[PDB]
Recover the amino acids of this structure.
């Protein structure tokens, strides 16, 4: 199992001021480190954060965290379940900041909650450097859903942080799972007046102000003050990133359809087919990517993540090919995007 460590710097906190932390497996044999970012939506004002604290408190507090966790999928240490990185050092960072891992604000007089997701990541990295990460050769920053978007926001900040601390030999990379969202046309429309009616662009715009959210500097320089919400969307922030990033995205992601107000007539058929085509287009020039034509959400820490295949290649294989490419390869591809246009036209889609 993975063992819990609460942060020694107790001023880096979850939403309610309790200390953040991380779960760690060690692997003295290995110089490879995997840091996984958990997902789970977000909140963007007092009222919907208060609701989250009553019925989703583990995503806002460490008071009730268990001592241990079992690694699954890419966090598993058994080769039978994890053909990719089963011998690596494993780290699971719980999502307890409700800020898509972007915040840098403390609980104070004027703030009922702390939003410190961006600071949680640097503090975990800092404390791991005394536990063997100083000798690493690859640091893979991974994440699912809101954690996948967090990879896109923080992967270059982790690189920068290690360069400034004097560790130029650690290769920082990113693996973003199910966090590649589109600010597309919704199937049905509502003005942003409450949680259920606010589109992602409007909700994130409010969240950034509420969290004191931070985005990558090169992306901020393009869109400039007040327009930082653009950098939460993968196809806009990805071209500004310098670290290598592998993008995993279902073509018909359930969270995307939810925020598009989709829950089949001709109008909805065309909408669903157009969504797959628009997602497929934004990945055209992403060299390392895995995008199956399925209706689902998340993959990389699911125990049966090895089942799905695109063009006959599994995700663990594609990630292995990505490793080899960073040392095209005969029979070991890294760009795998389905072209069939309906959910589950790939027979290997999860049931
Ligand atoms: C662009 O940045 C992001 C956009 C969307 C999400 N996820 C999200 O909205 N999840 C959700 C779950 C349940 N009900 C409604 C919504 C995370 C980041
Ligand atoms: C704890 O973290 C905060 C925020 O990053 C930082 O300002 C402070 O210096 C840290 N404390 C110590 C003792 O390193």
């Amino acid at each position: 199992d993975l063992r819990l460590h609460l942060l020694l710097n107790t001023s880096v906190t979850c939403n309610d001021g309790s200390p953040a932390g991380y779960y760690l497996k060690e692997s003295r044999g290995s110089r490879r480190w995997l840091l996984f970012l958990e997902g789970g939506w977000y909140c963007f004002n007092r009222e919907n954060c208060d609701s989250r604290y009553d019925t989703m408190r583990r995503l806002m507090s460490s008071r009730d965290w268990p001592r241990t966790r079992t690694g699954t999928g890419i966090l598993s240490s058994q080769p039978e379940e994890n053909p990719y990185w089963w011998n690596a050092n494993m780290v699971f960072i719980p999502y307890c900041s409700s800020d898509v891992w972007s915040g840098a604000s403390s609980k104070s007089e004027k703030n009922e909650y702390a939003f410190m997701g961006a600071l949680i990541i640097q503090e975990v990295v800092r404390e791991l450097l005394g536990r063997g990460l100083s000798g690493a050769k690859v640091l893979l920053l991974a994440g699912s859903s809101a954690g996948g978007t967090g990879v896109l926001l923080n992967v270059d900040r982790v690189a920068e942080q290690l360069e400034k601390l004097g560790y130029p030999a650690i290769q920082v990379r990113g693996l973003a799972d199910s966090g590649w969202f589109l600010d597309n046309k919704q199937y049905r429309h509502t003005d942003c007046v409450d949680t259920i009616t606010c589109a992602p662009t409007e909700a994130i715009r409010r969240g950034i102000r509420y969290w004191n959210g931070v985005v990558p500097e090169r992306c901020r320089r393009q869109f400039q003050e007040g327009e930082e919400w653009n950098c939460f969307f993968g196809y806009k922030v990805y071209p500004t990133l310098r670290s290598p990033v592998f993008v995993v995205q279902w073509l018909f992601d359930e969270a995307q359809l939810t925020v598009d107000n989709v829950h089949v007539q001709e109008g909805l058929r065309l909408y669903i087919q157009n969504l797959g085509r628009e997602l497929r287009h934004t990945l055209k020039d992403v060299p390392a990517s895995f995008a199956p034509a399925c209706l689902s959400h998340e993959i990389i820490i699911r125990s049966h993540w090895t089942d799905v295949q695109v063009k006959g290649t599994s995700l663990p294989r594609a990630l292995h090919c990505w490793d080899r490419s960073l040392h095209p390869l005969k029979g070991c591809p890294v760009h795998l995007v389905d072209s069939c246009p309906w959910p589950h036209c790939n027979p290997s889609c999860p049931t």
Notes: Residues 146-165 form the longest helix (20 residues). DSSP finds nine helices and 14 strands in the chain. The CA atoms of residues 84 and 317 lie 7 Å apart.
